[model samples]
Target chain A: SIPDIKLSSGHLMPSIGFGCWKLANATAGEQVYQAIKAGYRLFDGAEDYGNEKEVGDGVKRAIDEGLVKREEIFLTSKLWNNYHDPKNVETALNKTLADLKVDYVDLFLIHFPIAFKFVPIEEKYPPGFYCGDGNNFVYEDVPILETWKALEKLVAAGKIKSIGVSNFPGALLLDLLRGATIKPAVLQVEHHPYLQQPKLIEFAQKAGVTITAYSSFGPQSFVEMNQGRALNTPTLFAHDTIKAIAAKYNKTPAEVLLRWAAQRGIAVIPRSNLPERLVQNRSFNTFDLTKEDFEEIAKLDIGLRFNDPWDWDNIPIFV
Target chain B: SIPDIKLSSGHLMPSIGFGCWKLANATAGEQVYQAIKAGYRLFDGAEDYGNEKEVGDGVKRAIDEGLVKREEIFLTSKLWNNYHDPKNVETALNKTLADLKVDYVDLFLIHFPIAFKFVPIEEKYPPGFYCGDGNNFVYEDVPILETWKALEKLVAAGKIKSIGVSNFPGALLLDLLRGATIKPAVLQVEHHPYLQQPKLIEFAQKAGVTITAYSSFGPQSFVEMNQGRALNTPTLFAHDTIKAIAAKYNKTPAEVLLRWAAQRGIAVIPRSNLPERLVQNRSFNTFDLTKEDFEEIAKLDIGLRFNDPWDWDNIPIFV
Candidate 1:
């Protein structure tokens, strides 16, 4: 059984879930089929990923094979930026459901805490922040509050089992939490050894919001992209300290990093395109790392943010 | 003068000065007086009405005693909360500043956009939603960016020549305009209203920043604090508003709410203080409102607040 962390809202959530960031499109449905056969649940996807249909197909194929029931699998999808305005929230959620072939997802999130001008699916799939003109960036006059209000209404209607917020700062989270009658179930943010983000994470914890960490392997993930100088930066797997800690445990370096996060009570999602890594990630329940291990890994924190596109000149938030 | 707006960097601000709110201590050398004799080119005080001494002393004694070179004053101020922050941001300005010891104020302003926490200056000095406590009732940690950042830096970098902000939303303005190398020229909160709001107005805007306002009308300022609610409220004349607006405008409500504020853009110094009226307030224009105009108001809006202390519970922000 997967470990569960008690949420502020008194609900239990899986502390480890599969992250499907850049799986090959053609092979994704089969991959989901394989993951479930290997005993994985909680598949997370978003409109921006452009693979909802394939992910859905994979889920359906698994269910048909008698691997699991639909109720047992926790499916999560996100509302992309273009659907953030209150007026379009429901339509966007519906479109995602239709494509995924699910009547309701276990959880739905506001993909980003920003709103981009709305675009149609047929016009340009996933939109990718390119608002037709490609020359100018114009902010839709709508504010974040209006969009949250819309999501609150959806929650009341029971279209989603739970709703959450992602990529928000402490102040932004507190403001919404204060105003929201129905609280957000989870807060998704980039979390890695390079960016410990203590202040923000601590505040969220005190406020009773669960945190889900992404990019857990630090520069290991970015190196695959054209990160240039960043590619040369030490990878968590190659770091002598991580290797030393893993050797002490007789487990791999990957297990050391992932378990360290779980020890602090944070939910982590590490992506793996290969089957072997996926199997290794799901086996976190069998290993145990002590407090000393967590303390040593904490020293590895460099306090660097890998995704700061929004902070830098208004780049389309989709990347 | 400079196209009505100045660009400090990327932000556009207005130059002509105005005092939106203040509690002129009704003393000989208090805040209002200090602002004037300090070579204030523009005096922005108010009639939400109280302070007469400090504002009048700052202007009258200075010009009469040859302390200031001259007084081609540009004074401005506002009416009490009862009159606006609700109905018309304009008329509230007219009645309040009319009593100050100045002919016509240069500018006037809507003190705040939200009326969540409003109280009589007598019950509380500056009336508006003021949150300082860290826990339930107060907002020690929150973001007040939407308004303060937009106002202060926009004014300093020359968006508004002499800008003023009062009774701000709590935690709303904290060094909002990032990397603000310049200081704001003025800040008019409830000086005479009660708790003087020294920490909020002074700390956030920077110490050298000028503070102005009414409820100098003191206890009597609330008689008209709202429309018909005066049965329980105090009058600035006897209430906080009158006592304060009085010190600066110099005249009486019988004098100059219009002239004091009108003479120059004292943000809220109003034209009338009950004692001085037309003769003094209407004639309060010897200095060009220059020091008042050119003074650096604090820009890093740290102690985000607005509304007042007395109305703490009913305030939506507290909830």
Candidate 2:
């Protein structure tokens, strides 16, 4: 059984969500349809993923066949950096909505605190990390607070049920809390045993904001891209600490890993190419990792972060 | 003699400065006057130091007595959080100038990236974390960029020669770079070996921003305030690694530690109650710690940070 985490806005979000990143465009639609039938209730989509249109088609197909209602499914989308300009915030959301075939996304988030130069939709839809030819991806001179104000405007117009941010470290988030009229309902960032972010989670959670963790499998996601750090570090799935925890619970290491986050009341979005793996971890709230088990996993944190922007033209956002 | 570090703005800042914090008000002017005679060319001042008026008396007397001309010295002053409102930028600088008897400062910095609610000069002179007795020290909604734009206007008008931010983590600095019109000339932070921010330092320096490292003695400053962490951790002045390196170099451990930053092309702001200590380290540019000696000091980095905002009403800016 999945538990609902109450957002600052009083909206309930399921503890488990289907991560829409890296889902192939051709199969993303059917995958979402199957996920709904298998009792998945939260769908995590972002414009930069380049699969929103197909993912949305799957959601529409499920609803058309009476598998679920639109209100029952929590659809989350993100505003990419190129559209961080106040005037482009809504347009970015509209573009995602058009692809998703939805009136509004259940939640909309600023993909990253850094804003890039605005690229026209006609130039490139989603426009991720691309400004134009030979520009080296010029960044717009818009502060996160200025862009946040634009997100707040969308909240007032009901284009988004709630607004939040992703990939933001604690410092900027704390600054956001000071200026935001409507406090952030959620903060999504990379969280796993390798990068626990203990202090950040404690501070944000105490402030009544829910934490949504991505990359539950540690550097496994980036290992696909052949990151040197990932290549050298041991995988969470095969690590001795995780294997021992899985043996203790008589569960798969993947399931045990996802449960570690849920046990701390942190929402987790774990994805898999296999549908069976998806349904298996959907019960994040069902089983609990004991205090000792969680403590053992916590010790795995070596302060090794793979989700940093150190390679982004020398942008050190995590130091 | 101090070596001048070139800023991205093409202006030069001294590699070593005499810090103005914790100097007693009764003797601050005399100490500053003595420092000028001791060949100290850089003075680090801040509105939050609570002795700027007396500190100014020392600078004015030094210039009036012909001990040092204003052109021969670099005066760095910080803007406090209480006057973060864009409208209060000039008024705050004007108040600082009127007290210091100067037409313009060599360098002006935003004290911290976090902005506190505005408090009028009539109510409180420096206003260090005090916003009316009853309030829990409310923070103003103004973003650093908004405050920075105001500082830029001052620069164009020749009230401040250079502008930068102090105590900012690399993430927010990267964010500021995306929005900044005039590139930041410098960045100041607590940068001892115990809390060496390798990635941050490398990233900022490569971007052509001169670095000013404070708390060169690591935990020594916080120990004065009786911080528990500082109390428990070994001081750099007495640590085995530092003491051993000092013995090898035939220098005091304190002097050796400051040289580590200077050796890396980073600036040092070390303070002492005795003016002799200030003059002793003036030869920071004279000695060259061999690459081996530098690498040995680098090994002392444990990532332990003493200066933090965690105790600031549960705001965890560092994780």
Candidate 3:
């Protein structure tokens, strides 16, 4: 088993997890099942991912086959933008629960800081950016504290073991913390060598919250989405510096990237399906990178964030 | 009387305050004294500014001459970079209190997130840039929480009525909020049309933290300091768009700039030695900026931050 970081809530979270973003229904369940068999115990999913049913099926199959128990797996899902209103918080979580086929999620997070106008669950299960309009998203006036207070109640009701936030910048997170009765256990951000976000990580860690790195491979995740900035960004995986480090360690570029995040004491949720890659992803930290290697990679930080919703479709969510 | 905003701490802080930065000792006391007589009640000063004694003299003169009592005035000072160690927290505030001749201040702020190695008060009072080494700024390992917790204790002791932060990015502020026992009552940052930081302000305001804007005229403050970027950037005071807006309202460009911040519900602290300008800075919001005017100026947000320590002498404190 991989090492776990003890959350302020006293919960132990696996340092390495499997991310369920962009996982298609055709292969999600099988890949998730394979992941479980290969010892990837943490499954980071979100309601917005639109594959909770497949993720659920995979987890259930793994449990049925005597691979792992529910308690042994860390299941995470995110509260979507539309449900930021306290009135819709539970209703949204219930839909996620029903789709995930789980009585409770190990961790639940506020997906994004930007609140959107509420749409009934009947209107949409995973309302990506819809705000009761056609291609135009309207913001909800509900404040984050109202939604967070409801989440605290959810924890009291045993619907979620731990609560967290994702895609939140430092200031918003500080604002939430100012009012939070139940502090977030984790902060998941789009982190890689190009967008190290060192201060964000340091800040969260100092406050006793774990930081989970998504898009650990940098531009590789956004390129498929045809993001212009991602297209323009030189891929971190193919960079000569990363390549040199990987070659020096006789490891794959992917392994080097995952290991770098692990070395920094940040948890990672890298998604993969190949049997060897899954195994390597879970266990790559067995070999360590030198301090010099870490410092060298640190020089590559350009604050280039590919997944900022502010830049997406010119939505201005961050603004 | 200027309009006041009620802080989360239940203290009423004047929305239009007097910023005591860059006010030379030759005129600092007289300017602050004039500001108080002109109905400015909030006095924002910092130990790092090396003018606390002069600022205190100004406040004392106002009170002695029957302009306003101490309780009627909101006095703010900041804990500087060199005293972030928990042990030094009280020592730092004691010096500020002694210099300011006040038993308690209305607000105290962590001047910057950067922690510098402690230099004894006996060695150098207000140690602006020395990090125990000659002319070099070396960071101390003291975490923000340790310093924050110490500040909380000071609040309990009544050394400060409210605690806040300055020069914090969204992420670091979020981290501070997560662990803070007493939520920051105000966030003072360099603000103007050019470096609006809309997201940071929105996040803080939503969480009940009043934002105090400094450098209301973009590039003006830094230009005096000979900052290269500030010297190169177009001054907001002279911009054609701003001038057009001022002409439409028959207001000075400075009033237009100060009104723009007030229209957004943000507090401002525009510094000036001229009596008319000081009065205008305090009382400029008799008319509101039109939505069109606000939108026109909002276009000036290019994320241009001139006061960033990251750019100052290539210091990486912000990263």
| Residue B118's lDDT in candidate 3 | 92
Q: Which of the numbered candidates is closest to the native, going by highest DockQ?
A: 2
DockQ of predicted candidate 3: 0.11
Residues A238-307 of candidate 2 have per-residue lDDT tens digits of 9998999888878888888898888789998888668678777786455678788888888999888887
- Docking quality of model 2: it rates as medium
Instruction: Return the lDDT, model 3, position A147.
Output: 80
Measured by TM-score, how close is model 3 to the native structure? 0.64
Q: Would you list the C-alpha lDDT of every candidate in the order shown?
A: 0.57, 0.85, 0.84
Candidate 1 residues A21-89, lDDT tens each? 776689889988888887778887888888888888999998888888888888878888778778889
Sorting all predicted structures by TM-score, with the top scorer first, yields 2, 3, 1
Clash pairs, candidate 2, are: none
lDDT by residue (tens digit), candidate 3, B17-115:
888888898788888888877778888899999999999998899889998888998998999989989999999899999988999999999998777
**Model 2: residues with Cα > 4 Å off, grouped in runs:** A124-127, B119-125, B221-226
The order by descending DockQ is 2, 3, 1
All candidates: CA RMSD in angstroms? 13.8, 2.5, 8.7
